């Protein structure tokens, strides 16, 4: 199999750069249209990260920053599969996550929300998907938090995530939410996404048979990256 380029990103499936209801986008969006290019080796390659470099608690946000005790909050496991648009698993992709603690507070002096800091919660994790594109991490469910867009704006609970996979063209950062959170329906950030079906694609689902008794709940969340097409006639990449 000789690989060609990644399928074109479908701009209608993503938020536009300029989205007036998300006020900060007004001054941080290009006025010119993006220039589309035909792909080259630069766009279809990406770096490789070795498993050796990861620590044993890198994907366990409950314990990876625990000092005198456990962090306070709802214990949850989040798992799922990363695959490309043609349904092929994405192997050995670097998945990084970051989030607020149970009060909705980020561990940084910049965040001055009154929600309380947790001395035993850090809020960063990472892992590599396996051969089946599977990933799993454990954490504390983040709490929703206020921000200044309109004065009384509130983000639904969410975990930020980032993927570096096989091609630079697949590079993606996004955020997922939790089934049933009522703030999901009012968020200006989530509403930058044009269609309802794509907004639903960022909601992690309760996975009840996978809860661990007397221990943790579990949410299932799959991720889809752009996929490469195979070439059977002329290979123009090079």
């Amino acid at each position: 199999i000789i690989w060609g380029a990644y399928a074109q990103r479908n701009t209608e499936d993503h938020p536009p750069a300029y989205a007036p209801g998300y006020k900060t986008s007004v001054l941080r969006s290009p006025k010119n249209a993006l220039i589309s290019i035909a792909e080259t080796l630069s766009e279809v390659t990406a770096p490789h990260f070795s498993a050796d470099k990861f620590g044993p608690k890198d994907n366990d946000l409950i314990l990876n920053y625990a000092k005198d005790g456990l962090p306070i909050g709802e214990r949850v496991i989040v798992h799922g599969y990363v695959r490309d648009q043609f349904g092929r698993p994405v192997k050995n992709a670097l998945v990084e996550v970051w989030q607020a603690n149970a009060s909705g507070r980020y561990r940084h002096p910049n965040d001055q929300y009154i929600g309380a800091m947790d001395p035993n919660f850090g809020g960063c994790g990472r892992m590599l998907t396996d051969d089946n594109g599977y990933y799993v991490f454990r954490t504390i469910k983040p709490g929703p938090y206020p921000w200044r867009n309109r004065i009384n704006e509130w983000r639904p609970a969410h975990i930020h995530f980032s993927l570096i996979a096989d091609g630079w063209a697949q590079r993606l950062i996004s955020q997922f939410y939790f089934e049933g959170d009522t703030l999901i329906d009012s968020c200006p950030i989530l509403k930058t996404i044009p269609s309802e079906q794509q907004r639903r694609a960022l909601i992690a689902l309760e996975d009840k048979s996978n809860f661990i008794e007397a221990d943790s709940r579990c949410y299932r969340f799959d991720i889809t990256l752009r996929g490469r097409r195979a070439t059977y006639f002329e290979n123009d990449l090079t």
Binding site: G55, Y106, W168, A169, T238
Partner: protein, 202 residues
């Protein structure tokens, strides 16, 4: 067929969540950073630096930037590189950085990349691929950095010539400077407005 998961902004703490060590969150033993030069790495060492500006000219201090590039001979340290040439083994080709909180300047210590094949037998001028994430940016913005001392190669670059406004091509050319024996390329990024940097859908 599935639809790509929709992008969302990195949000206000993207440069803290993806570079915890620097925000003093010591959760990892091995941390990713903005230094791509290991001791046995080949090629000429260069420093790439600049600022990212919003539409009113204010530098962003919450931006997260990553670069992806080839080694000194123009080979990518990726299994998807099909040139059949051996890549420098002490080179990751990728790095990540945030802006300094006070100054607003970001930087990378890297190597000047060699030319990489373009489509249908062409040759691309040396370039570094760069992506920007930040609160207010809904989808990572892709651009490339070319070098002002490669004018000859730049004039024949497939991608640069793809841009019809000669005037916008220049926004992708970094300026070479020599700070005490060190070579530095200054590349400022203007997200919106006059001299807006060209961004690509790749």
């Amino acid at each position: 067929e599935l639809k790509e998961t929709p992008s969302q902004t990195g949000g206000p703490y993207v440069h803290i969540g993806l570079l915890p060590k620097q925000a003093n969150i010591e959760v990892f033993e091995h941390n990713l950073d903005n230094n791509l030069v290991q001791d046995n790495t080949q090629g000429q060492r260069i420093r790439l630096e600049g600022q990212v500006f919003d539409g009113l000219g204010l530098p962003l201090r919450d931006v997260l930037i990553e670069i992806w590039q080839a080694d000194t001979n123009g080979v990518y340290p990726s299994q998807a590189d099909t040139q059949g040439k051996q890549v420098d083994p002490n080179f990751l080709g990728w790095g990540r950085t945030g802006a300094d909180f006070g100054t607003g300047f970001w930087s990378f210590n890297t190597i000047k990349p060699g030319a990489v094949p373009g489509r249908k037998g062409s040759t691309q001028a040396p370039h570094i691929s760069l992506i920007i994430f930040a609160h207010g940016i809904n989808i990572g913005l892709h651009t490339r950095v070319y070098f002002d001392d490669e004018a000859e190669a730049n004039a024949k670059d497939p991608v640069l010539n793809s841009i019809e406004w000669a005037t916008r091509r220049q926004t992708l050319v970094a300026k070479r400077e020599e700070r005490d024996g060190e070579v530095v390329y200054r590349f400022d990024i203007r997200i919106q407005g006059e001299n807006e940097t060209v961004f690509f859908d790749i």
